[PDB]
């Protein structure tokens, strides 16, 4: 009831043994009371890393998207080493979503070892199980066995109806995923551990489908973008290998489903000046001239009977002399060109009324005309060439024309393919203009360039008119164990890409959210524009170029920082070489680097003086010792992980306050939230995500099941809580309910439709779906439902919730009226009470631990001690946690070496990895999450608690208590001990 503290552990250790005399009775009682539970105490075990690789093919339908929507790929499994390194080999194949699927080394859902099908953004198929939301459901198949050598896996995806189906060795899999969220793009993915051998098959020249595709499905190889090339890549990464060594990589830019639809602007509806009947006629004449010259060059002749084979021009006149079906066509062509020009914000009209006289045409010899004879002289336009603004105008005109063509094609049912298949109504140019290659852009732009040149030659009046930040900003720092407090230090950073790098020195208290230089904590340099950043970007030196190196320099003896570039010291505006002066030591400084989206760069410390370039030029002879020169182990580093995780509300938050009054009469204990700065300056308002610090768990078996009746109090299984929403808070865009431990969504405009939920439907031998279980990450009442239940009412909105652990049905209520929002869950699942609020008032929400008639308050399910106590209580452990967008995480010392190549046109791309890699994972019972044991270096409280826990183990095992030793053998393993002894970090 009072959280995790080490004083009580010391008390227990004192209870165990004293005066060199062991109380076996007390030791056994303590053992019985805590060891079997395996809860409320940290647990450790050794696991294996998991790595996932995708085929770089993104497909997903939308409103007007060019994606075909029906796709099919195949996977060969050739070599499997089962139970390698005393652990079963992990191997899964499936699909994953572009947004929300961010696998990282370690730190998986529950215990470590996450992969495809362990998160609701991904779906995978095991040997005999179906994985989704970290839930394992065995699947009935004609052959039930794990992934073995020489195995064939076929995965097919349909977007028209949301279906994902699988087949093993020609035998269809009897379970499918349906009703999943179609937001984003889907890509094939395989997750694996050490000792695997897989081969991709996507059809076409690549690989070969050993089994025929299902009807209506298309191979995945034809979905590659025209400028894109097939190449395997990992899902996401923060580091890479290169010639110099470890090269850090920043955020990766990704496309969206909305990008795949063309978005043009209507132009024919716009009225035009009367210049169309004068100057646009002359432009049409010029178009006729140029087109006739193109035919002349091609060898086309003037034969009045139009015949393409015989090269005959129907008009057969030097003047185009085209009829209304032809002349009007070319006239409306030019008219639409002018309409597009005006719609781009440019002008349409005339601005010289005399430059057309200056135009003198280009006379050509008689060889151009033949047959009846057509030699329209090209009207010379060299008098006015195309400015860069004019070129941009042509580019936008071509973009608009391609977009209107593409919207027509998608309206009539055109789907893009890498190959061209007119009978199947599929062209490679169906991608948007900016997605087109340079050749198609040129073919859609050349004639428009000529038309704009006609405009210029005549001299017209045409003249030109939060979470994303976290995802696109990445920060790297050190272990904080090497916080230098004195001396002179040097470290180098090679900026491989010209993009925005920020490198410098920061204090140990750098918040991951705060960008480098925006606060006094970090003195940084950004050479994208070439300025030093501290409380603002002030000019300093010059920006670098791709491949340059920055020699960052610090002397705490003189309290200054110096930046050099390629051996040249950057020199400020005032004339001081030092970027900053009088830099107080404070709590020390650490190297820090921040990378932008689509950026790479190498961070070289002082570990390798030989590899340290330009050190002799600037760093050496000035007393600046290379940082961490004497270290034999690599300097462990920490990366600014962009992953929403719930953390307790800090008491120093300038805008939110938690009051926590309790013990009132006729009112149950409660926790109040208030807006400190509401109705004042700098009163930021944004979506807020809150939950309780502890969960409640359902029964392992779902075997049905005035003055309150005591017998009904004892028999009842339901638990109740309430929420008091004060006046002034928006009754919409608010949610109250229960979230899974792994649930996390930092959406700025969150909605109940934005929750992740997929229905796994289990077909039988007859094809009839059974066990249609809906895995959803959250279950709570919609804000529209709240406002419908019900200016904002002066009486506070009452939001009651009833959880039934025995049966699994979930009930909600608003202001004493049971809201229609209801749910059903699975046995052995735990949920957290969560409230999502859009603050719009000084007083917003107040969570409340209350009871009702014949209803047991939450505290009984929340704590085992009070399981039969009807009095509602709020122990100090129960606290409110807010969703933290960014948190710091430590980079693993070593990474798996996976080799991916293309064996050939038959075997496809082959992926193989055989290097084992293990680590010790520390699991939190209540949070259902795990972290690396080495991460506890910066987490002293958890480290202290775990150390006291080990001391308690020694105390209970002391003085030859062999039974207790055997009992502890389960919790602490021999392999874990040996790995701990051989551990160095």
């Amino acid at each position, epitope marked *: 009831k009072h959280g995790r503290n080490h004083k009580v552990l010391d008390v227990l250790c004192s209870l165990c043994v004293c005066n060199g005399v062991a109380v076996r009775s007390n030791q056994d009682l303590i053992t019985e009371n805590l060891l079997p539970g395996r809860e409320l105490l940290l647990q450790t075990n050794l696991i294996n890393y998991v790595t996932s690789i995708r085929p770089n093919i993104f497909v997903g339908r939308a409103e007007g998207s060019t994606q075909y929507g029906k796709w099919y790929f195949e996977v060969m499994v050739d070599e499997v080493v089962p139970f390698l390194t005393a652990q079963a080999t992990h191997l899964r194949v499936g699909w994953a979503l572009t947004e929300g699927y961010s696998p990282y080394p370690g730190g998986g859902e529950g215990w470590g070892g996450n992969g495809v099908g362990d998160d609701l953004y991904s779906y995978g198929f095991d040997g005999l199980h179906l994985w989704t939301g970290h839930v394992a459901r065995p699947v009935t198949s004609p052959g039930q066995h794990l992934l073995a050598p020489e195995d064939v896996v076929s995965c097919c995806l349909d977007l028209s109806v949301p279906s994902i189906s699988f087949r093993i060795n020609g035998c269809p899999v009897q379970g499918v995923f349906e009703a999943f969220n179609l937001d984003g793009l889907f890509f094939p993915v395989v997750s694996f551990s050490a000792g695997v051998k897989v081969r991709f098959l996507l059809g076409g020249r690549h690989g070969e489908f050993k089994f025929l595709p299902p009807p209506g499905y298309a191979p995945c190889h034809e979905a590659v973008l025209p400028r894109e090339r097939l190449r395997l890549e990992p899902i996401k990464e923060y580091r890479r290998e290169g010639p110099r060594g470890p090269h850090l990589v920043g955020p990766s830019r990704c496309l969206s489903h909305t990008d795949f639809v063309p978005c043009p602007v209507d132009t024919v509806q716009i009225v035009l000046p009367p210049h169309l009947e004068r100057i646009r006629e002359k432009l049409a004449e010029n178009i006729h001239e140029l087109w006739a010259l193109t035919r002349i060059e091609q060898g086309w002749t003037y034969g009045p009977v139009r015949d393409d084979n015989k090269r005959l021009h129907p008009c057969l006149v030097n003047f185009h002399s085209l009829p209304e*079906p*032809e002349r009007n*066509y070319n006239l409306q062509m030019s008219g639409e060109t002018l309409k597009t020009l005006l719609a781009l914000g440019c002008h349409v009209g005339m601005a010289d009324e005399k430059a057309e006289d200056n135009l003198k045409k280009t006379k050509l010899p008689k060889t151009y005309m033949m047959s009846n004879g057509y030699k329209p002289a090209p009207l010379d336009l060299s008098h006015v060439r195309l400015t860069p603004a004019q070129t941009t105008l042509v580019d936008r005109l071509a973009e608009n024309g391609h977009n209107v*063509w593409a919207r027509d*094609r998608v309206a009539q049912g055109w789907s893009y393919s890498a190959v061209q298949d007119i009978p199947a109504r599929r*062209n490679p140019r169906l991608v948007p203009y900016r997605l087109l290659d340079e050749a198609t852009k040129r073919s859609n732009r050349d*004639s428009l360039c000529q038309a704009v040149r006609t405009l210029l030659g005549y001299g017209y009046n045409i003249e030109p008119p939060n979470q994303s930040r976290w995802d696109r900003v990445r920060i790297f720092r050190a272990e904080k164990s090497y916080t230098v407090q004195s001396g002179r230090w040097y470290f180098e950073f090679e900026a491989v890409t010209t993009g925005e790098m920020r490198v410098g020195w920061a204090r140990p208290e750098l918040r991951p959210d705060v960008e480098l230089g925006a606060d006094e904590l970090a003195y940084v340099f950004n050479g994208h524009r070439g300025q030093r950043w501290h409380l603002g970007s002030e000019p300093f030196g010059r920006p670098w170029q791709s491949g340059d190196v920055v020699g960052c320099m610090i002397d705490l003896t003189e309290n200054t920082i110096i930046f050099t570039l390629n051996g040249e010291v950057l020199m400020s505006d005032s004339g001081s070489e030092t970027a900053f002066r009088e830099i107080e030591i404070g709590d020390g400084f650490l190297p820090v680097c921040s990378l932008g989206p689509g950026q790479v760069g190498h961070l070289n410390l002082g570990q390798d003086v030989s590899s340290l370039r330009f050190f002799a030029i600037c760093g050496l002879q000035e007393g600046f010792e290379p940082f961490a020169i004497n270290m034999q182990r690599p300097v462990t580093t920490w990366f600014s992980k962009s992953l929403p995780q719930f953390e307790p509300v800090p008491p120093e938050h300038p805008h939110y306050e938690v009051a926590r009054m309790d013990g009132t009469v006729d009112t149950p204990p409660c926790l109040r939230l208030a807006h400190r700065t509401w109705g004042s300056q700098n009163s930021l308002v944004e979506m807020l995500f809150l939950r309780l610090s502890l969960p409640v768990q359902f029964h392992q078996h779902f075997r049905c099941t005035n003055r309150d009746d005591p017998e009904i109090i004892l028999n009842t299984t339901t638990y109740y809580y309430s929420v008091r929403v004060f006046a002034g808070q928006e009754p919409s865009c608010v949610w109250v309910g229960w979230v899974t431990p792994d649930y996390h969504q930092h959406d700025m405009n969150f909605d109940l439709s934005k929750v992740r939920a997929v229905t796994v439907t289990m077909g039988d031998e007859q094809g009839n779906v059974h066990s249609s279980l809906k895995c959803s990450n959250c279950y709570m009442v919609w804000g529209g439902d709240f406002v419908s239940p019900g200016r904002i009412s002066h009486t506070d909105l009452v939001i009651g919730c009833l959880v039934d652990l025995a049966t699994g049905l979930m009930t909600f209520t608003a202001n004493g009226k049971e809201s229609n929002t209801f749910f059903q869950v699975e046995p052995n699942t735990k949920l957290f009470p969560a409230v999502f609020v859009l603050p719009t008032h000084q007083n917003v929400i107040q969570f409340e631990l209350g009871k009702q008639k014949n209803i047991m308050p939450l505290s009984a399910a929340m704590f085992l001690s009070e399981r039969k106590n009807p009095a509602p209580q709020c122990p100090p452990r129960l606290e409110v946690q807010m969703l933290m967008p960014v948190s710091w995480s430590r980079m693993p010392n070593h990474f798996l070496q996976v080799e991916t190549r293309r064996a050939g046109e038959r075997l496809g791309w082959a992926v193989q990895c055989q290097d084992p890699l293990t680590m010790m994972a520390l699991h939190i019972p209540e949070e259902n999450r795990c972290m690396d044991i080495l991460e506890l270096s910066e987490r002293l409280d958890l480290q202290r608690f775990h150390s006291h826990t080990l001391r308690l183990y020694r105390a209970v095992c002391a003085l030859g208590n062999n039974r207790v030793a055997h009992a502890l053998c389960s919790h602490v393993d021999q392999a874990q001990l040996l790995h701990a002894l051989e551990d160095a970090h």
Partner: nanobody
Amino acid sequence: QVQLQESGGGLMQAGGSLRLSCTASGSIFSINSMGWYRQAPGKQRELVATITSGNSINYADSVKGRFTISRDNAKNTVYLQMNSLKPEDTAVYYCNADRVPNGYNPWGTPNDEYDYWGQGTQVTVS
């Protein structure tokens, strides 16, 4: 958008008369030209003698026989008369409307791609 259909072209012996009407319902704009296409079973879809508004008829190498064509812009219908039937004339006939007039477009790939096909109808020669 522009939904088009061929009506007619049933099975008849050699020399049988076959009237295939072709009608496209849609926006009246960019409706100046169109043609007919011939695809033998398992073969390429070549071009039947095309016609454009203004009664401009253009022939090709697949016109050996009676390939009569006649268009009416008021009701926007085009009739193809297949009176000469030959063993090699058995094919699926499609009807395709396009903005490109007289088989030429001084614009390039966009307008060229600005075409509208039709469901078509199968014709077999006995």
